[PDB]
């Protein structure tokens, strides 16, 4: 099985190993597209405290194709990490970052107390809002929230509040420590998929009867070096009767001719059983390396002793041989 070199990986590392995250009230989004989604750096990592998929199991995810993958990132308290899930409610789930009940994706989070703390009030969350958020919405306005019946007129006051509240993140705080949260949302649209996981390839064995899968084509046969060249964009060659002639190898870009695995009729050459029960066997149109062994044009003949002396023909084999 052969697939081409992966030189275009999805930037999960850029999202996860970022020097800075956004506030949850103003969470960031980056689109992941037209790349290979290698999740082996996410699900085999012991550094994450939270790793839960609400869409599809990680064991299948690394073999699925999507049109778009979105990585939503923000910093919240450890006690609020549990709110980042479908069906949940709370100050973060309702006013800062809402996931739909039918969310398809994975929520990954880890402790960032060794960096994102001081108090560090750079990270903020929405405390008040007129109504909750729609799935994947964002609200970064600073309009003063009116809790009472008296117009706020743009300022704080009796039953009037600035909508945001900062996090008091300090190095000495588990529930009040900062956590970096990344949500990976995966979708399949009517559009062609653009992001697939990596595919593994096997080594290529030459001059042997094998099954094979090259890119998107399959078949069986023997792979040998070709003496023909293809145009720069061509992936495989085809014969007159529309059968595969050759394939261009995805990693080496070398061309390998494909021949059918040796086959042919097997016939028994025998004197009449009235005089002898000794027989010779002829394998038609095959090599003796594939099956008193005599290689001829008719096939590989076993049991008959080849001699230099010619005689009038008795039992015909073919191609001048009797």
């Amino acid at each position: 099985v052969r697939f081409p070199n992966i030189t275009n990986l999805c930037p999960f590392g850029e999202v996860f190993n970022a020097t800075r995250f956004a506030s949850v009230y103003a969470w960031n989004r980056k689109r992941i597209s037209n790349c290979v989604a290698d999740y082996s750096v996410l699900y085999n990592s012991a550094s994450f405290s939270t790793f839960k998929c609400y869409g599809v199991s990680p064991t299948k995810l690394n073999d699925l194709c999507f049109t778009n993958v979105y990585a939503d990132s923000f910093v919240i308290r450890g006690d609020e990490v549990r709110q980042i899930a479908p069906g949940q409610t709370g100050k973060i789930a309702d006013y800062n970052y809402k996931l739909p009940d039918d969310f398809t994706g994975c929520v990954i989070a880890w402790n960032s107390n060794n960096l994102d703390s001081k108090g560090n009030y750079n990270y903020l969350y929405r405390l008040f809002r007129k109504s909750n958020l729609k799935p994947f919405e964002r609200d970064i306005s600073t309009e003063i929230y009116q809790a009472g019946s008296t117009p706020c007129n743009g300022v704080e006051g009796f039953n009037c509040y600035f909508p945001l509240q900062s996090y008091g993140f300090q190095p000495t705080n588990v529930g009040y420590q900062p956590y970096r949260v990344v949500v990976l949302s995966f979708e399949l649209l009517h559009a062609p998929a653009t992001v697939c996981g990596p595919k593994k390839s096997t080594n290529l064995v030459k001059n042997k009867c094998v099954n094979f899968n090259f890119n998107g084509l399959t078949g069986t046969g023997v792979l040998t070096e070709s003496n023909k060249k293809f145009l720069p964009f061509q992936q495989f060659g085809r014969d007159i009767a529309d059968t595969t002639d050759a394939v261009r190898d995805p990693q080496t870009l070398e061309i390998l001719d494909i021949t059918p695995c040796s086959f042919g009729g097997v016939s028994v050459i025998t004197p009449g059983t009235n005089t002898s029960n000794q027989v010779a066997v002829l394998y038609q149109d095959v090599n003796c390396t594939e099956v008193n062994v005599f290689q001829t044009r008719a096939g590989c003949l076993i049991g008959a002793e080849h001699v230099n002396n010619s005689y009038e023909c008795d039992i015909p084999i073919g191609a001048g041989i009797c």
């Epitope: 939270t50 790793f51 199991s57 990680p58």
Partner: antibody, heavy 119, light 112 residues
Framework: EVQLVESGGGLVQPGGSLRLSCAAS????????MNWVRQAPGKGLEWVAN????????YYVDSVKGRFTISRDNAKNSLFLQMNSLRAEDTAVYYC????????????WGQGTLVTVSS | NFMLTQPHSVSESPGKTVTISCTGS????????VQWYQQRPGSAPTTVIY?????PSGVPDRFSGSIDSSSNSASLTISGLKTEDEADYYC??????????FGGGTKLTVLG
């Protein structure tokens, strides 16, 4: 068809040491996480150690830290546990198991090798 | 560090449904996947339920479960109890304070 085969149990004195092994086939070792899980008689299950697919990293439960070493050989198709300074409290049945991914399930289990510590 | 605990004695009549629970402390059980294992006497525990609600081949649809995130707990239910279901059941999850965390086990008896 995936199978796990264990050996190396028996009676050891306190402060002594031994190596347990879990030979296996039906899969490529370098593609899977390998673990040891312990169960003392009359007790529930507890985790002892975890080793990464390529052996590049190792994890231990605090109770065996500094005493037990988890190691693997992907060419010999076998998982090993080297247990040093064994204590009376370490008397237990040791199981080997295969894990698809770090936070996933233990898909295959051995039968369990009994180690008894007594002077 | 995060730990799991279970009830010792759980039992129910054959043909009926029994609930086996597991609770967490010093961390959140719902932040990771929960597995359930069944150990019949004489051998090793094997997976019955994994990743909250999935099951391996050989396990019937009588085995299912969920995680109650607001209660920091999880459970499985076994419907249609058979006398072959007598076993020691275990819960397992993952944390950063304790990599692989197992519960103390539940003894399930089918009241035949």
């Amino acid at each position: 068809e995936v199978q796990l085969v264990e050996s190396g149990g028996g009676l050891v004195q306190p402060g002594g040491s031994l190596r347990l092994s879990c030979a296996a086939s039906g899969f490529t070792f370098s593609s899977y996480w390998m673990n040891w899980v312990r169960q003392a008689p009359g007790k529930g299950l507890e985790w002892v150690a975890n080793i990464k697919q390529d052996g590049s990293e190792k994890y231990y439960v605090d109770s065996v830290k500094g005493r037990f070493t988890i190691s693997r050989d992907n060419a010999k198709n076998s998982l090993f546990l080297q247990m040093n300074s064994l204590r009376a409290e370490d008397t237990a049945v040791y199981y080997c198991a295969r894990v698809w991914w770090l936070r996933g399930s233990f898909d295959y289990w051995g039968q369990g090798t009994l180690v008894t510590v007594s002077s | 560090n995060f730990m799991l605990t279970q009830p010792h004695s759980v039992s129910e009549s054959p043909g009926k449904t029994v609930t086996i629970s597991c609770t967490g402390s010093s961390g959140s059980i719902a932040s990771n996947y929960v597995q359930w294992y069944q150990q019949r006497p004489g051998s090793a525990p094997t997976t019955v339920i994994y990743e909250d609600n999935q099951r391996p081949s050989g396990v019937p649809d009588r085995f299912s479960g969920s995680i109650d995130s607001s209660s920091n707990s999880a459970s499985l239910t076994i419907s249609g109890l058979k006398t072959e279901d007598e076993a020691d059941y275990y819960c397992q999850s993952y944390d950063s304070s304790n990599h692989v965390v197992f519960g103390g086990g539940t003894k399930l008896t089918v009241l035949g």
